[PDB]
């Protein structure tokens, strides 16, 4: 008696009876940054049903949603369990699951409060979520208002952007300041500038070691026929100017899940004001105060030579396999030998294996398992790289929210390994 509007309610023992079944998928609608920990509605333990996955009930305007539903394996077979922080937040999924061939759909009616409630209905989290923002957090912020997660005094948010101030000045986070990329890397070798030159940067951004930074960038559809697609990829660049202020001691980093998207997506108000700098006079700590966040071409021969140790290439296939460099101002093309391959995307402009389509990150579980299939863990030293290092940073980025204990960024990249030309390399379809 199949009925697209009538959705059959599951209870919560039968879904306590059925957490190990490999037949069953159950399904989180809530928001990403609910999913990954965020107490959205007050609830004392955050997170997700142990086991579930995420499938926020905001991408049923995605024209692409079935395919999302397929890549993530969820099949007309399965026994499909839907739950939200109420059944009404799951209606539209389960008949949109009901009008795609999915013939078990079930609500379950009860995750809030009587799961969330309850010490002994598993529940998981992504381990250090309170570094990847929600909108509504930065909002709260920004308000002086309370917000969870922060117990500080002094706060910056910061539009990231490569050499692309219209990035900032088209639309930015009301009072945010921007910070161009080139502030904290150099363009001579696209590592992380020195440390005297770091601590100006930011003390002339207003930025010491005891401010929380709110990092965001803003994705302006890049186009390797550009002379600099990395203009428009400004929230792979936030990820990677939180990655070297991490290394350098900023003790408090967040990054906007999502970046700008998330900000308009929530319905936030937009400024284009050109907002001065409020510099201040001093950083406050050494730099760096992480130094093991980054790893340099003689750590990262070691690491190819180490038991316990490897280096990620977080780079595009057409990359891995020697057909293009991946950038027009690299002529090398090839990759560095012993690395492992966790492919970003489909070229050095996108995180799509990193993602979700609106930019947030994937869920983790999904990351954690590819990984773990190419032997990438957490009992490694893991250095995570791309061609100069901002896909790298991202992959960092994800492995650090996990809580992972010994991952960095090897810093150099492909554009530095190639550039000698006694480093050996390897080309062409393994
Ligand atoms: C280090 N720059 C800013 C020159 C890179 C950054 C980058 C973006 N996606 C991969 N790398 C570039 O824009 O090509
Ligand atoms: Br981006
Ligand atoms: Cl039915
Ligand atoms: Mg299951
Ligand atoms: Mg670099
Ligand atoms: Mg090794």
Redesign the pocket.
Known sequence: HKNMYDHTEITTDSLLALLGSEKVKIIDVRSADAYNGWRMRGEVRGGHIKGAKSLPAKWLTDPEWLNIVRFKQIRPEDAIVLYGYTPEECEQTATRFKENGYNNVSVFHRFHPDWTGNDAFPMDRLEQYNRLVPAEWVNGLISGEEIPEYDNDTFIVCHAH??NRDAYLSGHIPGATDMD??AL?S?ET?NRRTPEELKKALEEHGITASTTVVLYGKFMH?DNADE????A?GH??AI?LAFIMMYAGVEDVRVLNGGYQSWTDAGFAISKDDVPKTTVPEFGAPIPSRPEFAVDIDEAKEMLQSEDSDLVCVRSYPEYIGEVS????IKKKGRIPGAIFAECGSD??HMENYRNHDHTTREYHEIEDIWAKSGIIPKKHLAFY??????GSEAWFNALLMGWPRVSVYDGGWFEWSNDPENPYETGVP
Do not use: K
């Open positions: 490569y050499r990329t080139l890397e363009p696209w890049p600099f697609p990395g203009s990829a792979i660049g990677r991946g950038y027009n101002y050095a402009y791309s061609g100069t290092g901002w896909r």
